[PDB]
Amino acid sequence: GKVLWDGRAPRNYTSFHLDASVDPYLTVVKGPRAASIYTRLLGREVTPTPLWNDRLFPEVPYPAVSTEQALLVLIGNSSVFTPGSSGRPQTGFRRTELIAQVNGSNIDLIPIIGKGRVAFHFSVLMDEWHKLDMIHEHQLVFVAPSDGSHVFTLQVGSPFTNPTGPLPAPRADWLKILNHNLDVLFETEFTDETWHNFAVIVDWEKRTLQVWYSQNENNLVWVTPVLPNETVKRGTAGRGDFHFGILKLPLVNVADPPEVRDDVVHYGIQPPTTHGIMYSGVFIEDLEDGLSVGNKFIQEVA
Ligand SMILES: OC[C@H]1O[C@@H](O[C@H]2[C@H](O)[C@@H](O)[C@@H](O)O[C@@H]2CO)[C@H](O)[C@@H](O)[C@@H]1O
């Protein structure tokens, strides 16, 4: 399809771009430190997903050239988001996110990524140096309407519950795609040293979702049918911004009064530890001709 927004970090992108919050990323959703403190551009240290590589002729010595660099998104004890200038700090969450924008504007992108059929691409790689704690829930990728709901979510870690249940949950370390109602559509183990490639097709007209997945250099394959996602609101209230990064929920603190334990935005246990995940292959396309499945192939989608 036609690329509507490209979040595949250029090889020439720098910390200075992130700190200026310029295209393609709005960088405001983070703690008070500079964007480049939480999000690192990995250069040639980490090979990004091979799906969007270019290929050389001849095919030795180098078969492939990377067309992007991977991003390392970190959260730590300072990763407390304050809404606006004056909001109550979100002390229950630890979060660092990048939001899709064009011309310095998330607003202008809403109608573009929110009409017709749109494929949301993203690949993730486990960070071995700052391990995620799968005792907690992490919301990694989502499209969020103004009400803060998620049209879909890529999640990993044990889902937050009040009261606390057995932890870790079964398959806590499985990546999960959820619908807007939080139903698990697809789940797969978050194996290390592997690029986990996804596309989620949103049909904004019919309010459906379809999940596509592969590992490493393998082309995306469909792993769900076209599924209804009918809890999404009608019209503009069902559209919203594309986020990727880490949004870590807390655990219940029984020391808190019962009346606030559900308010994970402001209450709950968060250890003062650092955690990361790596991203590549993050972009949004329409479905003209078909879905980009990797390796310079398109596949027609019904
Ligand atoms: O309110 C609890 C839910 O918070 C969700 O995070 C939202 C938040 O509510 C919004 O105000 C805004 O800050 O965006 C956040 C991320 O979309 C969270 O996703 C849910 O899991 C919580 O139940």
Side-chain angles (χ1 to χ4, degrees):
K2 185 176 76 81
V3 174
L4 303 179
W5 168 85
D6 199 340
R8 290 172 293 190
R11 292 167 293 172
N12 63 7
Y13 216 69
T14 73
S15 63
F16 291 93
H17 292 82
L18 283 174
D19 287 346
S21 194
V22 290
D23 288 357
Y25 314 111
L26 167 64
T27 62
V28 69
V29 178
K30 55 166 186 67
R33 304 186 70 181
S36 66
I37 290 297
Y38 305 108
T39 297
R40 301 181 179 162
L41 289 153
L42 293 175
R44 19 175 297 300
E45 294 170 44
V46 171
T47 304
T49 181
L51 288 191
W52 321 110
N53 288 344
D54 285 343
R55 294 170 73 199
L56 289 156
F57 173 93
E59 306 194 57
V60 79
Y62 306 100
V65 65
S66 295
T67 59
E68 61 180 303
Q69 62 183 310
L71 294 145
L72 172 65
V73 172
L74 296 167
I75 53 162
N77 201 54
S78 72
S79 297
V80 173
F81 179 63
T82 297
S85 58
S86 298
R88 179 172 177 180
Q90 300 189 325
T91 46
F93 291 159
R94 293 294 183 275
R95 70 196 294 219
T96 299
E97 291 150 40
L98 299 176
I99 294 171
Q101 67 174 201
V102 62
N103 307 309
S105 179
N106 70 107
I107 294 304
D108 293 341
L109 193 61
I110 292 167
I112 298 173
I113 67 167
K115 288 174 185 173
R117 291 193 306 159
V118 179
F120 296 81
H121 290 260
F122 42 97
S123 302
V124 295
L125 168 66
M126 177 169 281
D127 178 16
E128 287 308 304
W129 300 94
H130 322 85
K131 294 176 194 173
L132 294 168
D133 179 11
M134 303 301 186
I135 294 293
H136 291 249
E137 174 176 346
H138 307 74
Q139 297 165 18
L140 298 178
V141 179
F142 48 90
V143 172
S146 71
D147 68 356
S149 69
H150 295 173
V151 170
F152 67 92
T153 307
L154 175 72
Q155 186 194 63
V156 75
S158 299
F160 168 86
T161 72
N162 177 34
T164 307
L167 291 171
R171 301 193 302 282
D173 63 346
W174 290 36
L175 299 166
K176 313 191 183 59
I177 299 288
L178 316 182
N179 72 10
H180 179 265
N181 194 52
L182 308 184
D183 304 303
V184 179
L185 308 187
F186 175 69
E187 54 179 3
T188 195
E189 182 181 350
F190 197 5
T191 55
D192 63 336
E193 302 195 347
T194 304
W195 280 108
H196 295 273
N197 311 126
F198 295 80
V200 178
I201 302 178
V202 182
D203 183 339
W204 296 107
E205 290 195 304
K206 293 155 227 146
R207 300 198 313 294
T208 65
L209 297 173
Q210 187 178 33
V211 187
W212 298 64
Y213 173 77
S214 70
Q215 296 187 1
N216 303 139
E217 77 281 4
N218 297 108
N219 292 345
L220 294 176
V221 300
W222 59 281
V223 295
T224 71
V226 176
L227 298 164
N229 188 206
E230 300 270 12
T231 60
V232 173
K233 287 173 177 164
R234 301 266 210 170
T236 59
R239 272 67 167 200
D241 304 312
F242 180 71
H243 296 227
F244 72 106
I246 305 170
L247 163 47
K248 180 179 178 177
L249 266 62
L251 307 176
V252 169
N253 191 347
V254 290
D256 290 324
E259 298 95 309
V260 302
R261 289 175 192 157
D262 292 307
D263 179 20
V264 292
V265 181
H266 305 114
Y267 294 93
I269 295 166
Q270 283 288 3
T273 44
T274 299
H275 310 278
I277 198 172
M278 285 173 278
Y279 283 94
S280 67
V282 180
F283 71 106
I284 299 166
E285 64 178 343
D286 70 22
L287 280 302
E288 192 188 7
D289 303 308
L291 173 73
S292 302
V293 295
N295 298 117
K296 308 295 189 198
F297 287 103
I298 54 163
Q299 180 166 341
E300 294 185 349
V301 176

